[PDB]
Design a binder for this molecule. Sequence first.
Ligand SMILES: *[C@@H]1O[C@H](CO)[C@@H](O[C@@H]2O[C@H](CO)[C@@H](O[C@@H]3O[C@H](CO[C@H]4O[C@H](CO)[C@@H](O)[C@H](O[C@H]5O[C@H](CO)[C@@H](O)[C@H](O)[C@@H]5O[C@H]5O[C@H](CO)[C@@H](O)[C@H](O)[C@@H]5O)[C@@H]4O)[C@@H](O)[C@H](O[C@H]4O[C@H](CO)[C@@H](O)[C@H](O)[C@@H]4O)[C@@H]3O)[C@H](O)[C@H]2NC(C)=O)[C@H](O)[C@H]1NC(C)=O
Ligand SMILES: *[C@@H]1O[C@H](CO)[C@@H](O[C@@H]2O[C@H](CO)[C@@H](O[C@@H]3O[C@H](CO[C@H]4O[C@H](CO)[C@@H](O)[C@H](O[C@H]5O[C@H](CO)[C@@H](O)[C@H](O)[C@@H]5O[C@H]5O[C@H](CO)[C@@H](O)[C@H](O)[C@@H]5O)[C@@H]4O)[C@@H](O)[C@H](O[C@H]4O[C@H](CO)[C@@H](O)[C@H](O)[C@@H]4O)[C@@H]3O)[C@H](O)[C@H]2NC(C)=O)[C@H](O)[C@H]1NC(C)=O
Ligand SMILES: *[C@@H]1O[C@H](CO)[C@@H](O[C@@H]2O[C@H](CO)[C@@H](O[C@@H]3O[C@H](CO)[C@@H](O)[C@H](O)[C@@H]3O)[C@H](O)[C@H]2NC(C)=O)[C@H](O)[C@H]1NC(C)=O
Ligand SMILES: *[C@@H]1O[C@H](CO)[C@@H](O[C@@H]2O[C@H](CO)[C@@H](O[C@@H]3O[C@H](CO)[C@@H](O)[C@H](O)[C@@H]3O)[C@H](O)[C@H]2NC(C)=O)[C@H](O)[C@H]1NC(C)=O
Ligand SMILES: *[C@@H]1O[C@H](CO)[C@@H](O[C@@H]2O[C@H](CO)[C@@H](O[C@@H]3O[C@H](CO)[C@@H](O)[C@H](O)[C@@H]3O)[C@H](O)[C@H]2NC(C)=O)[C@H](O)[C@H]1NC(C)=O
Ligand SMILES: *[C@@H]1O[C@H](CO)[C@@H](O[C@@H]2O[C@H](CO)[C@@H](O[C@@H]3O[C@H](CO)[C@@H](O)[C@H](O)[C@@H]3O)[C@H](O)[C@H]2NC(C)=O)[C@H](O)[C@H]1NC(C)=O
Ligand SMILES: *[C@@H]1O[C@H](CO)[C@@H](O[C@@H]2O[C@H](CO)[C@@H](O[C@@H]3O[C@H](CO)[C@@H](O)[C@H](O)[C@@H]3O)[C@H](O)[C@H]2NC(C)=O)[C@H](O)[C@H]1NC(C)=O
Ligand SMILES: *[C@@H]1O[C@H](CO)[C@@H](O[C@@H]2O[C@H](CO)[C@@H](O[C@@H]3O[C@H](CO)[C@@H](O)[C@H](O)[C@@H]3O)[C@H](O)[C@H]2NC(C)=O)[C@H](O)[C@H]1NC(C)=O
Ligand SMILES: *[C@@H]1O[C@H](CO)[C@@H](O[C@@H]2O[C@H](CO)[C@@H](O)[C@H](O)[C@H]2NC(C)=O)[C@H](O)[C@H]1NC(C)=O
Ligand SMILES: *[C@@H]1O[C@H](CO)[C@@H](O[C@@H]2O[C@H](CO)[C@@H](O)[C@H](O)[C@H]2NC(C)=O)[C@H](O)[C@H]1NC(C)=O
Ligand SMILES: *[C@@H]1O[C@H](CO)[C@@H](O[C@@H]2O[C@H](CO)[C@@H](O)[C@H](O)[C@H]2NC(C)=O)[C@H](O)[C@H]1NC(C)=O
Ligand SMILES: *[C@@H]1O[C@H](CO)[C@@H](O[C@@H]2O[C@H](CO)[C@@H](O)[C@H](O)[C@H]2NC(C)=O)[C@H](O)[C@H]1NC(C)=O
Ligand SMILES: *[C@@H]1O[C@H](CO)[C@@H](O[C@@H]2O[C@H](CO)[C@@H](O)[C@H](O)[C@H]2NC(C)=O)[C@H](O)[C@H]1NC(C)=O
Ligand SMILES: *[C@@H]1O[C@H](CO)[C@@H](O[C@@H]2O[C@H](CO)[C@@H](O)[C@H](O)[C@H]2NC(C)=O)[C@H](O)[C@H]1NC(C)=O
Ligand SMILES: *[C@@H]1O[C@H](CO)[C@@H](O)[C@H](O)[C@H]1NC(C)=O
Ligand SMILES: *[C@@H]1O[C@H](CO)[C@@H](O)[C@H](O)[C@H]1NC(C)=O
Ligand SMILES: *[C@@H]1O[C@H](CO)[C@@H](O)[C@H](O)[C@H]1NC(C)=O
Ligand SMILES: *[C@@H]1O[C@H](CO)[C@@H](O)[C@H](O)[C@H]1NC(C)=O
Ligand SMILES: *[C@@H]1O[C@H](CO)[C@@H](O)[C@H](O)[C@H]1NC(C)=O
Lengths: 77, 449, 449, 122, 122, 122
Amino acid sequence: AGLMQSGAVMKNSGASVRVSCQADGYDFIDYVIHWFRQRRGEGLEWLGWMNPSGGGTNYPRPFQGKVTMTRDTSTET
Amino acid sequence: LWVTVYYGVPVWKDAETTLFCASDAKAYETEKHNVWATHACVPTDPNPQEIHLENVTEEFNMWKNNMVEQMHTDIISLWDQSLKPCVKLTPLCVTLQCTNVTNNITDDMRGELKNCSFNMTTELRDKKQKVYSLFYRLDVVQINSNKEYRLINCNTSAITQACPKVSFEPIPIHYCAPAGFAILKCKDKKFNGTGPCPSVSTVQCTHGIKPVVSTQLLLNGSLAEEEVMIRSENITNNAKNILVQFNTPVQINCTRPNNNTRKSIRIGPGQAFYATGDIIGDIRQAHCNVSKATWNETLGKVVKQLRKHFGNNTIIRFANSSGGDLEVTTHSFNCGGEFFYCNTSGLFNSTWISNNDSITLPCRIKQIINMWQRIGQAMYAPPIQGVIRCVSNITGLILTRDGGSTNSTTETFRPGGGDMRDNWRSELYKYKVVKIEPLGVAPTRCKRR
Amino acid sequence: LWVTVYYGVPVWKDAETTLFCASDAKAYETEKHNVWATHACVPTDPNPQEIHLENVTEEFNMWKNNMVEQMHTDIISLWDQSLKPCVKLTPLCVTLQCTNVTNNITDDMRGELKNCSFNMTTELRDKKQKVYSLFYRLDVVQINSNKEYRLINCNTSAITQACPKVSFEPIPIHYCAPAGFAILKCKDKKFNGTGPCPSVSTVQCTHGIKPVVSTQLLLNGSLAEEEVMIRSENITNNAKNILVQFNTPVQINCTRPNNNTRKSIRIGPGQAFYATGDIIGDIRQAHCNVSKATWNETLGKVVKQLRKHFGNNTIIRFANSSGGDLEVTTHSFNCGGEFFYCNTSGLFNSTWISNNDSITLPCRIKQIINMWQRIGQAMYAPPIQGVIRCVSNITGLILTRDGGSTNSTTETFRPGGGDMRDNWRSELYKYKVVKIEPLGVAPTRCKRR
Amino acid sequence: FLGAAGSTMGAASMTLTVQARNLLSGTVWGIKQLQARVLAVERYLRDQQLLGIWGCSGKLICCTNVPWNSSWSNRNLSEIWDNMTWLQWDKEISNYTQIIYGLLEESQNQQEKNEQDLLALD
Amino acid sequence: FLGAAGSTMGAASMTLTVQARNLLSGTVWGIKQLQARVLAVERYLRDQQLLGIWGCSGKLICCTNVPWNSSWSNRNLSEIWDNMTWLQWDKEISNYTQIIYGLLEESQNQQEKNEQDLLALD
Amino acid sequence: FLGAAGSTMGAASMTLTVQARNLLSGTVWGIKQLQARVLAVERYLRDQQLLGIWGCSGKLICCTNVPWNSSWSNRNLSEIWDNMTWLQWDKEISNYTQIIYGLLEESQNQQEKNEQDLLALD
Ligand SMILES: *[C@@H]1O[C@H](CO)[C@@H](O[C@@H]2O[C@H](CO)[C@@H](O[C@@H]3O[C@H](CO[C@H]4O[C@H](CO)[C@@H](O)[C@H](O[C@H]5O[C@H](CO)[C@@H](O)[C@H](O)[C@@H]5O[C@H]5O[C@H](CO)[C@@H](O)[C@H](O)[C@@H]5O)[C@@H]4O)[C@@H](O)[C@H](O[C@H]4O[C@H](CO)[C@@H](O)[C@H](O)[C@@H]4O)[C@@H]3O)[C@H](O)[C@H]2NC(C)=O)[C@H](O)[C@H]1NC(C)=O
Ligand SMILES: *[C@@H]1O[C@H](CO)[C@@H](O[C@@H]2O[C@H](CO)[C@@H](O[C@@H]3O[C@H](CO[C@H]4O[C@H](CO)[C@@H](O)[C@H](O[C@H]5O[C@H](CO)[C@@H](O)[C@H](O)[C@@H]5O[C@H]5O[C@H](CO)[C@@H](O)[C@H](O)[C@@H]5O)[C@@H]4O)[C@@H](O)[C@H](O[C@H]4O[C@H](CO)[C@@H](O)[C@H](O)[C@@H]4O)[C@@H]3O)[C@H](O)[C@H]2NC(C)=O)[C@H](O)[C@H]1NC(C)=O
Ligand SMILES: *[C@@H]1O[C@H](CO)[C@@H](O[C@@H]2O[C@H](CO)[C@@H](O[C@@H]3O[C@H](CO)[C@@H](O)[C@H](O)[C@@H]3O)[C@H](O)[C@H]2NC(C)=O)[C@H](O)[C@H]1NC(C)=O
Ligand SMILES: *[C@@H]1O[C@H](CO)[C@@H](O[C@@H]2O[C@H](CO)[C@@H](O[C@@H]3O[C@H](CO)[C@@H](O)[C@H](O)[C@@H]3O)[C@H](O)[C@H]2NC(C)=O)[C@H](O)[C@H]1NC(C)=O
Ligand SMILES: *[C@@H]1O[C@H](CO)[C@@H](O[C@@H]2O[C@H](CO)[C@@H](O[C@@H]3O[C@H](CO)[C@@H](O)[C@H](O)[C@@H]3O)[C@H](O)[C@H]2NC(C)=O)[C@H](O)[C@H]1NC(C)=O
Ligand SMILES: *[C@@H]1O[C@H](CO)[C@@H](O[C@@H]2O[C@H](CO)[C@@H](O[C@@H]3O[C@H](CO)[C@@H](O)[C@H](O)[C@@H]3O)[C@H](O)[C@H]2NC(C)=O)[C@H](O)[C@H]1NC(C)=O
Ligand SMILES: *[C@@H]1O[C@H](CO)[C@@H](O[C@@H]2O[C@H](CO)[C@@H](O[C@@H]3O[C@H](CO)[C@@H](O)[C@H](O)[C@@H]3O)[C@H](O)[C@H]2NC(C)=O)[C@H](O)[C@H]1NC(C)=O
Ligand SMILES: *[C@@H]1O[C@H](CO)[C@@H](O[C@@H]2O[C@H](CO)[C@@H](O[C@@H]3O[C@H](CO)[C@@H](O)[C@H](O)[C@@H]3O)[C@H](O)[C@H]2NC(C)=O)[C@H](O)[C@H]1NC(C)=O
Ligand SMILES: *[C@@H]1O[C@H](CO)[C@@H](O[C@@H]2O[C@H](CO)[C@@H](O)[C@H](O)[C@H]2NC(C)=O)[C@H](O)[C@H]1NC(C)=O
Ligand SMILES: *[C@@H]1O[C@H](CO)[C@@H](O[C@@H]2O[C@H](CO)[C@@H](O)[C@H](O)[C@H]2NC(C)=O)[C@H](O)[C@H]1NC(C)=O
Ligand SMILES: *[C@@H]1O[C@H](CO)[C@@H](O[C@@H]2O[C@H](CO)[C@@H](O)[C@H](O)[C@H]2NC(C)=O)[C@H](O)[C@H]1NC(C)=O
Ligand SMILES: *[C@@H]1O[C@H](CO)[C@@H](O[C@@H]2O[C@H](CO)[C@@H](O)[C@H](O)[C@H]2NC(C)=O)[C@H](O)[C@H]1NC(C)=O
Ligand SMILES: *[C@@H]1O[C@H](CO)[C@@H](O[C@@H]2O[C@H](CO)[C@@H](O)[C@H](O)[C@H]2NC(C)=O)[C@H](O)[C@H]1NC(C)=O
Ligand SMILES: *[C@@H]1O[C@H](CO)[C@@H](O[C@@H]2O[C@H](CO)[C@@H](O)[C@H](O)[C@H]2NC(C)=O)[C@H](O)[C@H]1NC(C)=O
Ligand SMILES: *[C@@H]1O[C@H](CO)[C@@H](O)[C@H](O)[C@H]1NC(C)=O
Ligand SMILES: *[C@@H]1O[C@H](CO)[C@@H](O)[C@H](O)[C@H]1NC(C)=O
Ligand SMILES: *[C@@H]1O[C@H](CO)[C@@H](O)[C@H](O)[C@H]1NC(C)=O
Ligand SMILES: *[C@@H]1O[C@H](CO)[C@@H](O)[C@H](O)[C@H]1NC(C)=O
Ligand SMILES: *[C@@H]1O[C@H](CO)[C@@H](O)[C@H](O)[C@H]1NC(C)=O
């Protein structure tokens, strides 16, 4: 089962990008998602979470507006 | 010492059973066929039948509870029911030559509503039916030409039209248990949802409860009493939504302020459609008004009632939502049949320290829901002619704590929600189901023949 | 002598009641919503609860039995259930511009599969939808032009598409009775289905049983033990099909050996179709392999186990079927969702007297069933990408005796079947339902006050 | 549980305690086992009723103020508790159960409790 | 009704009469309260059965021909009717209820009613 | 069966044995007679419960340690078993049934079985 992270990718200063977590093996709607980051030799960091139900989230203070995490219930993604 | 048993003893334990409603009598008479959905719901014990309990304390857990999920499965069951025989809508996923508006109603109501035109099944099978109707912007979607749109649902989920005879009025329901099962009823006013509650009664026919349908804002609910109350399964867990109950009723007046007109379209036989017609006179957006200073003082007593957990001096701040579906990002709810989504943005741009008109926030109306993520079926909210006005009390709120990783520096909140079950927990906080066993045996120097 | 009654006495008689399943616990956890169909089936007594019986003999009749037909009505009931909410297919009885194949796959797989192309409802109502899909030869039919075909069902019976979330895996089910009713359990290994059985236990929760679905060949079933067993209601009646149970498991490996691809066609809203795409790489026919010499020796021990009825020296011969529908003329069955029909012709062209690779017989796949003659509805067997492989044990067989009117000259057999109920009798052979009455009165010189 | 119905009646008499133990032991397709449990309860209660309307009701065993009938298969005392079994008896008894019941339920307690009233007064 | 489970056992003993009063007190979504009432009846009857198979059956209170066991929490006479409550007892008792039942339902009436037969004859 | 409710009470007293005989006597549209049989059982059991919680339980007839009340329609001994019928009585009695029940179910066995305990000890 598990989850599908898209492959690594390069972009550019400024700019913007989108990343995919595909879910297989259970209830997309139940349960909740979080995201995390490890920089160049760094203690891991929390990014944010989404309940895939209504869609409610919570972005930590220093990353609000920076990040935009979402879901698609039908694609279960 | 011998043994001797006793039938009727005071002993029970943690169990959860099936339970039944109770909808009293004066609801029973209103002629016009069927009501809410309580078809065979049996009326209420007209006397308060409760028994105070002496020197007993046991532990309520408002999240480990069950009758909340009982009522949840119940209401999605009767949701399915309600519409099950109602009119289908399969000939609406059709192309839609549309446009905007023609009346002096400001950009405040610019377009948004749409004047679509399209063919349709007649009563018969052969003839088509060139027709036209008016729709809120969120019911339609572009497709790559003049103005042909699609309904939002037609790539996801079929849709049925509610029988117009249904009315969306929450009615006080008395959930009542069977015997062998009792409801322990907590009777202090300071019970943060978890733990043992000393002040208790025993009850079977819980009070009349309206299953109010709203996000972020909790409507017509129960009061708290002295010191407004707040509850979390473990608030340090920010992700645990926070549910709050007021000791103070918040006045709220909502209004969809346009005089509509209805179209009994004939997609017959039998199945008749109900469309929007053109509107009477001016056009203005639905919205709601609330008493400014009462709002002020309630959020006062709140922010007073929180720093206890977060240090008598901490930085508080509120904000508009973290971005969700229209149900969670706004105050979604129903009034008088149709469905509002209120931009609750205006009531949180604030920061709180330590110890004049009235507020008009606007709401936009939508007619296409598939609620409880129950997609596969959508409900067409039929139109209502005339205008709509709505008196309501606000009694609680669903909120989200920001996780500002510091120590106890700055903590900020927003109206949470999404999971509807809390609007039930918020009146289920005060009940526990117990299975009694009337048997209990004791040793004693007593002989038989 | 007076009279005196007794409550709990050991007396019962021939009765048949309603009974309930039992599906144990480790089946209960696999997350993903619903299983087989056991939604409320209650788990199994985790201990073998049985009682051997002393000096009791009474008569089992495996054909006069009932719980077989109980399970039969049960399974067609849940068959109806299973698909009841699943996706309809009414826009498929449509003309079908088709053709054959384009890949180096021999005449062994020549055409047979078809590459049809046709219009379709969109998500919306207006637009058509030019599309194309691939089908087994037996799903389609000519009509008097290039290559326009029809689905087989469209002149007989509508069709629904199974919800893909369903899986066709037989799971051991424990049929369990109520009280007052007992199951007498025969415990010799030599019980030709009829007559009294001395070696018996009493039981309520019968063993876990998989309702394997196959014709001629009996799969994953129960073993016999020492001397393979055979049963007929009266075999002299040739028309009485003969059911045989093995003491020996027959290895069988089936394979549909092509890597498919699936199409979530959008005939929306909601209702999404699932079509065949083009195939990965080479194409080869489904088939099955079986260990030659084990087959040899099992049919040995059989032909040894039959002439007892037909003289220690009689002419035996087997053959391919007497011509029936594809279900009975071949080894019909399911593996991994999709549905095989195996040309069991190859395993019977033999003649038996008195006292090396491995066998590869091919099977062709069909997706359109209406099984149990339950026409009026058909099931679309949806596709599966990748390849399919299937380990199975063969444990019994359904056969037909030729009526060669002589005296006991030559008698010849073929794989019978058709009536599915035998695959149940073949594990129902060992049970009888008895209604106990706990009451029994006797004369005796005892007085009351 | 129903241990040895083939053991004779006098042997079997030792315990009548487990056959009366598991005899209760604590959506369509879901309607059915409800329909089954309910008549299991009715059978139990039909029993307890036929029981209480007899002087019995006192569970399991109960002596009675009516004797035997010759014709009802004249036999012997050791021929049945030592040489017979339960169904073995009731298959024979099938031919007379009805008026047996009829006479118990009438000619007993009705007389017996009325006579009792005639002494439950003084 | 369940008035004061926190009152001690000797106080609570005064009436055992209302907890046994309202314990019965006289379409889908309509199937459910049927499914509930039915097992309320079964629980009542499981009770009455466990009761009658004991020498009890005589409602509410019933003395019995088996005494105590030391190890089963040796305590005192005034420490429980004057200082304890009901669940307070049965939470302790949870650890031994089973063989208690087992010995009642067997070693009692079965012996007791057979001995009774041994005198209900002469 | 309900033979002659118009025969007087003393005549009717002779048999109370058949009205208690057929009183149990052994898909939608199929759900209904289930819903009916079930409350027939509940009515029977409500009866047997109201019965057992009285000193009665002993079926059919049962003398009791509470007498009469003057005001409850003072009448005579021959005026009712020889000149009245059953409903004829209970239509009058409709006005007092409740506290009748209330006093039986309390002031009787509760006192009576506790006093019995007070002698079931020595
Ligand atoms: C939620 O909150 C929002 C925001 O506050 C509310 O929106 C308000 O909505 C109301 C009605 O929906 C609007 O009322 C209209 O006001 C206009 C303008 O009136 C002004 O100018 C005149 C002179 O030009 C003044 O005399 C007016 O003074 C009014 O108020 C004072 C008190 O402040 C009062 O003493 C005056 O007499 C006068 O009131 C009325 O007096 C007599 C009777 O007493 C009456 O005959 C007269 O018509 C006055 O209305 C004011 O400063 C006014 O022209 C409108 O009336 C006309 O047009 C409409 C449309 O055709 C007709 O229906 C009507 O009969 C008149 O012909 C309205 O009265 C208001 O402007 C608006 N905004 C604000 C800031 O209040 C929502 O209503 C709230 N909703 C809910 C559910 O809570
Ligand atoms: C049911 O029963 C039927 C009938 O028996 C089975 O059908 C068989 O199916 C298999 C696979 O599905 C077929 O296998 C293929 O064989 C070909 C031809 O191989 C021959 O020629 C070469 C030289 O040209 C010989 O060296 C081969 O010898 C093989 O077998 C011997 C033992 O007999 C072994 O010692 C050899 O090493 C060799 O085996 C393999 O060796 C190495 C690893 O050990 C491996 O790298 C090599 O590729 C050999 O396969 C033999 O005489 C062969 O070319 C095929 O391989 C290639 O093509 C496929 C297709 O692209 C690729 O997937 C694969 O990787 C290779 O590139 C296959 O191996 C077999 O011919 C066929 N028929 C018979 C009679 O066996 C079913 O499979 C059975 N199914 C079930 C469910 O039971
Ligand atoms: C929404 O759009 C519909 C289009 O289907 C509008 O209906 C049509 O509106 C036009 C004007 O916009 C009408 O035209 C005029 O009609 C009158 C009377 O027939 C005639 O005297 C004029 O010469 C001109 O042709 C048209 O009749 C009307 N048709 C129908 C069936 O309603 C509708 O007015 C729009 N509504 C809003 C609120 O924008
Ligand atoms: C919370 O309680 C208030 C108080 O009743 C509710 O206000 C009520 O709103 C409904 C419509 O949503 C009104 O119903 C309609 O009333 C009019 C006239 O009364 C009648 O013409 C209609 O046929 C319909 O019955 C209702 O009257 C009104 N209450 C009162 C006292 O007038 C409010 O709806 C409740 N909250 C929510 C979310 O519904
Ligand atoms: C929550 O509050 C924040 C800020 O308090 C709102 O942020 C704002 O987001 C909107 C939409 O993303 C931005 O709007 C843009 O404005 C231009 C010019 O008016 C308009 O032409 C564009 O079409 C676009 O809508 C806006 O710049 C941005 N910042 C501010 C200060 O408004 C956010 O919309 C609020 N969200 C909710 C759900 O309440
Ligand atoms: C089954 O039949 C369908 C027909 O609907 C085949 O799809 C079509 O197959 C043809 C070739 O047989 C494709 O033509 C070529 O397309 C490519 C890419 O567009 C182009 O470069 C060539 O010039 C030529 O036009 C056609 O595109 C293709 N269309 C679709 C929508 O698939 C399908 O290949 C057949 N499959 C098998 C296994 O036979
Ligand atoms: C008779 O019993 C055998 C033994 O289990 C059955 O073989 C089984 O076949 C099924 C498919 O029909 C396999 O299920 C699938 O398994 C794979 C990997 O195990 C998994 O990826 C799939 O999601 C699915 O669960 C099953 O694994 C396989 N048994 C074993 C032990 O691997 C056979 O199906 C039975 N007979 C019949 C007629 O079904
Ligand atoms: C059972 O076995 C018999 C014989 O053992 C099979 O009989 C044969 O039937 C087929 C079809 O009726 C005949 O086939 C013809 O063959 C020609 C040339 O190969 C072909 O071009 C025709 O299209 C036709 O199919 C065949 O002559 C006939 N005899 C033999 C010896 O094969 C029968 O098919 C088997 N049936 C089953 C259900 O196993
Ligand atoms: C409603 O149906 C009419 C036909 O009665 C449509 O009018 C046709 O529109 C198509 C657009 O593709 C033109 O090609 C035809 O020439 C039109 N006239 C005809 C067929 O007489 C009209 O577009 C439809 N409106 C919808 C679907 O919204
Ligand atoms: C909304 O529009 C309708 C239709 O124009 C109004 O209905 C009329 O109302 C007036 C005044 O109440 C009556 O005299 C007419 O007889 C009504 N006619 C019809 C066909 O309904 C309605 O009144 C408007 N809304 C309000 C609040 O006045
Ligand atoms: C919400 O509506 C109620 C009723 O329409 C308003 O209450 C009235 O308030 C006015 C003054 O604002 C008083 O003169 C009335 O006597 C009140 N009547 C009732 C029934 O309450 C309330 O003020 C409104 N609040 C807002 C924010 O619009
Ligand atoms: C799918 O629909 C197309 C039309 O979009 C069909 O193409 C037409 O086929 C008919 C055959 O009778 C011709 O007379 C027309 O000239 C064709 N072109 C058009 C209408 O533009 C096509 O045959 C359909 N394919 C099916 C039903 O398999
Ligand atoms: C059947 O075909 C599919 C599609 O080509 C194969 O799927 C790929 O498998 C390879 C190897 O396992 C992976 O590296 C790819 O990421 C897969 N892609 C997709 C889209 O599924 C599949 O593997 C083939 N069957 C087998 C048995 O290999
Ligand atoms: C059916 O499949 C099984 C398993 O794939 C085969 O059994 C294997 O047989 C080979 C030799 O034939 C052994 O080396 C393996 O150790 C066996 N493994 C298992 C798990 O059984 C069996 O031979 C196959 N039979 C046929 C007729 O194809
Ligand atoms: C006993 O049965 C015989 C049958 O031979 C019958 O004549 C007799 O009347 C029966 N006894 C009584 C008391 O009825
Ligand atoms: C039965 O008992 C009688 C005496 O009452 C005796 O004569 C006869 O032999 C006995 N027979 C059997 C089979 O017990
Ligand atoms: C009482 O419990 C003790 C446990 O210490 C056990 O040894 C003893 O056997 C029990 N009494 C009886 C009569 O079994
Ligand atoms: C219990 O009673 C014993 C005598 O049997 C006495 O020694 C002891 O102090 C008492 N303790 C309590 C707690 O009652
Ligand atoms: C009998 O009824 C009378 C009514 O006149 C009442 O006064 C009296 O108290 C009743 N008897 C008892 C014992 O309560």
